[PDB]
Symmetry: C4
Amino acid sequence: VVIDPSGNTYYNWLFCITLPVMYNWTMVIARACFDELQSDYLEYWLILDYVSDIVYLIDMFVRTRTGYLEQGLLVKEELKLINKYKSNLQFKLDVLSLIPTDLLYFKLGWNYPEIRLNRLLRFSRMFEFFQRTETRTNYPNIFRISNLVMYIVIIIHWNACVFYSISKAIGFGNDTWVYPDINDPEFGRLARKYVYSLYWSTLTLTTIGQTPPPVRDSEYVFVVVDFLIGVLIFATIVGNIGSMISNMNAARAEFQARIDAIKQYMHFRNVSKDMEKRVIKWFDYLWTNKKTVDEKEVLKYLPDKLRAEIAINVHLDTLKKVRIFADCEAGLLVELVLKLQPQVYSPGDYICKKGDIGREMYIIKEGKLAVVADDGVTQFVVLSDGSYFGEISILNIKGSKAGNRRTANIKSIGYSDLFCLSKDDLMEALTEYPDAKTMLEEKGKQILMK
Amino acid sequence: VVIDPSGNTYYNWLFCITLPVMYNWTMVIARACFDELQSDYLEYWLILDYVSDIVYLIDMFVRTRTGYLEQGLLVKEELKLINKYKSNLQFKLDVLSLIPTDLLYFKLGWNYPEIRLNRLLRFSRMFEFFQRTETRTNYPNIFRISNLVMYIVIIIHWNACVFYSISKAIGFGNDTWVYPDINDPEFGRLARKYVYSLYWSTLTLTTIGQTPPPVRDSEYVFVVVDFLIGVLIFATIVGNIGSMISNMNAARAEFQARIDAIKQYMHFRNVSKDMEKRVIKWFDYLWTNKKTVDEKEVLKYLPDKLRAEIAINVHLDTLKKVRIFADCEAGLLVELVLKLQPQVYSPGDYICKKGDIGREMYIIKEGKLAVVADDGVTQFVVLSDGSYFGEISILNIKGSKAGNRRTANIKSIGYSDLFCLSKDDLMEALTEYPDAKTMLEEKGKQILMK
Amino acid sequence: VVIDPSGNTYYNWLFCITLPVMYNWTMVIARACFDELQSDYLEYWLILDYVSDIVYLIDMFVRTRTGYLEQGLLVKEELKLINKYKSNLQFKLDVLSLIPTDLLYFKLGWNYPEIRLNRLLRFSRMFEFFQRTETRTNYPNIFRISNLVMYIVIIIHWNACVFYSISKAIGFGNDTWVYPDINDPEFGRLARKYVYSLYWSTLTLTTIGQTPPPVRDSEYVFVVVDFLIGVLIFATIVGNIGSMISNMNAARAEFQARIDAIKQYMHFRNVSKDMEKRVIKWFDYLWTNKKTVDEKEVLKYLPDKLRAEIAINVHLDTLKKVRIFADCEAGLLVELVLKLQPQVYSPGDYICKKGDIGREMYIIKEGKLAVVADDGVTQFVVLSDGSYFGEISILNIKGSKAGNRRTANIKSIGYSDLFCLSKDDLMEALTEYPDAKTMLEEKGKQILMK
Amino acid sequence: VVIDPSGNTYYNWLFCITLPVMYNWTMVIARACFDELQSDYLEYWLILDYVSDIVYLIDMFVRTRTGYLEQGLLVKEELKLINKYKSNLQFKLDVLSLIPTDLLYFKLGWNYPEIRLNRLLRFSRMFEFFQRTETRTNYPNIFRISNLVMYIVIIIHWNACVFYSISKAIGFGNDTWVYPDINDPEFGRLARKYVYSLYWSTLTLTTIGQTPPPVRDSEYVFVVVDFLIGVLIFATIVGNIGSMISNMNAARAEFQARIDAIKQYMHFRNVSKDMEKRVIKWFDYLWTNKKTVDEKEVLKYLPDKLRAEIAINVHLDTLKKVRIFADCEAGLLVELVLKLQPQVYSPGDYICKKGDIGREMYIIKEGKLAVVADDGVTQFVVLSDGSYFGEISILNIKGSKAGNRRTANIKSIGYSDLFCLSKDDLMEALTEYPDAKTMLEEKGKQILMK
Ligand SMILES: Nc1nc2c(ncn2[C@@H]2O[C@@H]3COP(=O)(O)O[C@H]3[C@H]2O)c(=O)[nH]1
Ligand SMILES: Nc1nc2c(ncn2[C@@H]2O[C@@H]3COP(=O)(O)O[C@H]3[C@H]2O)c(=O)[nH]1
Ligand SMILES: Nc1nc2c(ncn2[C@@H]2O[C@@H]3COP(=O)(O)O[C@H]3[C@H]2O)c(=O)[nH]1
Ligand SMILES: Nc1nc2c(ncn2[C@@H]2O[C@@H]3COP(=O)(O)O[C@H]3[C@H]2O)c(=O)[nH]1
Ligand SMILES: [Ca+2]
């Protein structure tokens, strides 16, 4: 065997089947409308159509060999897959899109390729590929815009073909509106035919309407309907363009809107230009160093038993340098990684101060912190990455003259990325295995006596 | 009896009255402006107008026979309904729209059907039908787009009629702007008249303006006003189109935006392509198997005493296979169905692990789980649908060497849809009837000894 | 005083000063550009300009006599108000807009009314009136759309005047782009002048561009700049139109989106058409009876000491029929009115059932409820409006064989609007005055014995 | 060293390098396409190009001398900065944009300035400056709109240059579509050349299309592609304009939407016009006095150890007049400034009333309050700014006949801005230093006895 739709093989086949479906959606109508296209390159159209039909057949086979999830397990029983396929509307659409209507080439002649129009009924495969690509691609907005542009181009191409067909029905050159006479040297070339039809279609669907006005009632009606199709469908698509660009700007726009609200508040309250500059510097840091997004709000949509792995694969850089995690229990790190709230501190920010509520443990992910003196400048100890502080005031200790108080003040030399671990959480998670707690308050007593 | 507006009969009548109202809103102005329309098909217009008026009268009768809610009860007293009708502005509008202005046909002649313009004053019924359909239809966006297209078409039709009337007032063919001379063979046909007027209206309201420019001051003024009506009203309607398409994409766009934020985080943090593939697979599963929507956020707008029924009608498939619910008390299932949080687990995800906080009971809705050994591969027990686990570590038990600990580790073979029932909730809800609890810890002791 | 800007007198004056400001913003540029406008109606323009200037002077006086809030109190000291006025930029703008530039009529002649262009510098007053109207009017969206249309019209009018002025500078009729020769009988009329200039402006600002193309470099540059002004500013304004219509649809669109999510869930889960019809009926009820909006989310932006008054003025209809409120303490009703959560129940919905957690007291605002038998049909007692139930299981009672249990089952005959009062809240709020509690458990014992 | 990108020097250099990048992005294509531009002002183009290249070199030097943050510290080691520069793609782009392609002037002649097209590869610097300006400027929306207008102008300019180049390739005047013959006196001027090309570009990119239609297939194709570029890219940019105006209106629109929901509720519930006027007055006050924004929601994105400084720099005006803060401990004010919830009370609003739950302490930021008698009018004490009340009922006091009760009723004479400090918070924060608490209940006893 089976293909496992989640796999890469299924996605690759989705591409390989979208190619014929897109080809069919673009060219069947073109060949049906522009007769010279069908006739001049008939030897190539036959090859391409037969290849497309072969790929359609192989796609039907793949649909027979693609497993589905019952009880969460991939069904691998062949006949069960055949039944699941045939019971779905997709099998009906596939049989309809693979009906050998090409036999009508013997009745209607080689000049009627619209018999292959049923081949469009595999559009679903194409759309599936798109909805898969949009999910799996690393450039979701680039692909989304390319998809919208493809839709625009297909719509304009189809409307060009429709215009040319209507000109044919009315008669080429019978009036100033229809496509001019084919017998003209310049206006008889297939290139000119298609490109002028596309020009007309673009002027109509984009509602520019710089083309010769209608003469007959059918022409007036078609032009009204087509200008309305233009207005509505092009507003739809080119406003989807707008929404895609909006969601492209979503993060940056939200960040900038927050900054603007802050600046409005500061200018209204006449906040000192010192503090205004400090705030602007904080936000410039958040942007430049790519910290505007908070991983919590993003990863909250992941499963906890997958977001856990995510956090591990991101923070194993530092949670191996820490003494508590991955050293004593070697598994405890998972119990708290999904609750280590990542904080960022500016240079000179006092994370801790003597005589404060010690309700948070900190793990230094990045940055240089200092166990300073209360004078403000004298740096007693420099804590680099992997260090952990703020854990002594969490625990119950014998001989602690300072209970629930910070034993020292910790300031940040530079921008520090820390993991604030709350006291309640450390309490709750160390209950399972105190084999790490013993050396934890080993460190605790050792630092509390000195 | 009375009609009970909530019923299907009332909605069917809403359709049957919207038909004449829509007919009146489309055709009265057309016949008033295009005199040949009124004259040539007068025998049909008379029949249709009289049928419309009869339906208007029957709609007034229905309004007299439609109950309203006082004290939440449907008023069935006839005279009370007559008073409620006559006291409402709707009765005034109905009498105004049913005034026999057709008598003016004897004074103004058969060429003045705008006397029936008062018939437009039942627009409310039409709109009511729409606002009912949008609520009750299964295709809300299809109907909404059809409604907007109907508004566009009606506006363009009315503007076409207005253009033709203005041409008539100025005189057909008196200058290049107005509709050409009626005496022309081609430009005198009612078909050509209406269709060219519609063409002009479309070019003007869609602000394409490819029509002959104004010559007189009245023409310049009307064209300015009409181009502005075009800009404003068509932006309104065709931006409502945009918002409707947006809300069509709302679920998919939110899902894809979450996936994009996740992928941005993973690529920025250089998350391993293993875990990136796992996350993409999780999201592909959520989409393909239609799990992107969380029933909680959707059904939270339902009444609890209706959302309860909803959850029952959805989850009675599994809550009959469970041993606790619908078996001992047979009513307890409602006390917890509105708090069974549905979770989804990937293949191989450890739902439970030995030596963890047993604070959640799980009911396997769909999927195969395994009571494995801690080695990781040896599957002791396979739990299929209807099974419940994680309930032993909830309860107070005699002789439990493992208190508040998982007696075994449960992993998911495939994608498991479970119902996580919190410990606090099971505690709170079993307090009412311990007739099920006794066999609950029957199972508990039986599994805790073996 | 003083005038007290919050008062109605200040708003009326805002209108009376917006009239000259709007007049000045519309007509000064018109008279400056269309010389015939200035000249032909000079006797009227002089009167209107002098009246506008008098009103400007009276507006300056009002600004001297309008109090401001210092320490939250309206300043009534005259000289303090004069200082507050003169210290503001508004005084500078007012003196600039009232500078007697009309004296230049003696130097530049009566054909130069753009000397009155400084009169536009009172635009602020106009805008203030708008921002006041939008706040105080009952039709905020009608006024907002009218304001946007006024901006569109003013912009188009100004661009028409600019086009005519540029034609004058280049010379009327010197090329096909500029306004045609004034000496023409038809193209020399002030009506034709202004209306064709407005036509050109509309075709340009709405980016239709169906006007004679530029001939000179200045004309090309102006047309480029004006088409870009068109694109940008008209997108701005006519997209503000879109956002205004969106916020017009905001409530209805949110309601309908909730209904659509519900219907999607129900159709996906194959919810029985019984329950689907019940849900659709619930939502039809919510809409038809105007219950889609929840007063909590709306009134949460009001002050509690004003939202309290709001809730009182709305619910004194029923909280006078209740026995506890406004009867014993006569002031207790305010302590709980801001926490009476309004619920709606469908016909047949069991609000209470025997043997359930009695943690909510209910006050029947509207609707008929029944104290039924557990059989389901036998109605023991019918509770109409003003009745209160679910209070016995809240209180501590002697001789209650049923503790924390519902003494009877309450069902809703029809759609009941109730006030669910939580047990914790009744406990917390009755602590202040048990003078009502005594008769409360009077009723309690009386019903618990029978 | 180093430059410290957060500093003002780096931003100034960002401007000084954006000037050549913008110059290059505007003029290289212009000179490449309009040959007369390159030739006539070659002496000036050479100077400007060499100055631009010198500034590019100095920008490369700056990039070598700009520190980056490792461990949150600004790297000042020269060679480390050289490595960080050369290891980034920016160094590749800078070397590519500074390659001396001007040497090709000796081969291709002075008429080929597109060899300087590589100079566009420093676009990043320009964009960086923009993203810095948008952050640091006080007019974010003005700058954003200016940036979008710059993008529009650059796109139109580039498309004008492209049109002129295509006309050159096809041949000037070979058909009606291309730019006319250069040999024409009027259509040969560089001014006319560029300005008509810009006119064509504007008519095409804004999809007005009032220019001579295509004649050749290449012209038709280019016009189709360019009209589509117009539609898509101009919708993008001029809808970004819409979103920028939306976020300009965001605060005012949210405020007005809240007011509209309130007014809809009041008119639907038939709220008395007294209370409707009171609510409208409250909202008029909120707007006029600039209180629609709540500093909590804005400043919650700031760091707590920066939002603290913000609140201090804003509220030190009053927290120096208070007796508790900045007087006894002199540091306690920071422990509670981030939890002082700012409330606003209308004139006559009873903040406190005798016999109520004293769970909030109030600090009068602005406004006159009264310790009144319960009669309602007799004002015992007038509390101005700096005063604090509601603190007696917080504390545990000996001899308090009124426990957890308000000792008096406090009403607001005028609009009072207060700081509501919750009881729990005062309890929690005074635990650290009771040196202020002693005089706190000094005041407490002193007022409780009298
Ligand atoms: N007092 C003290 N604290 C230190 C030293 N080195 C690291 N620390 C950390 O500084 C922290 C300050 O807050 P805590 O008292 O909670 O915990 C303290 C220790 O974790 C040291 O040498 N002396
Ligand atoms: N230990 C054990 N647990 C089982 C077995 N079969 C099912 N389970 C479930 O596995 C669950 C693991 O978590 P709990 O200990 O809370 O509850 C356990 C039982 O509900 C079994 O055979 N042995
Ligand atoms: N048992 C009983 N309850 C009644 C009667 N009339 C009204 N009620 C209300 O029905 C309510 C059901 O819930 P509670 O027991 O909390 O409170 C009960 C009473 O408030 C009655 O006649 N008998
Ligand atoms: N009773 C009384 N209260 C006063 C007086 N002056 C100020 N107050 C304040 O009024 C407040 C009312 O609420 P509290 O009793 O909590 O605290 C009271 C005091 O803080 C006074 O003279 N008498
Ligand atoms: Ca257009």
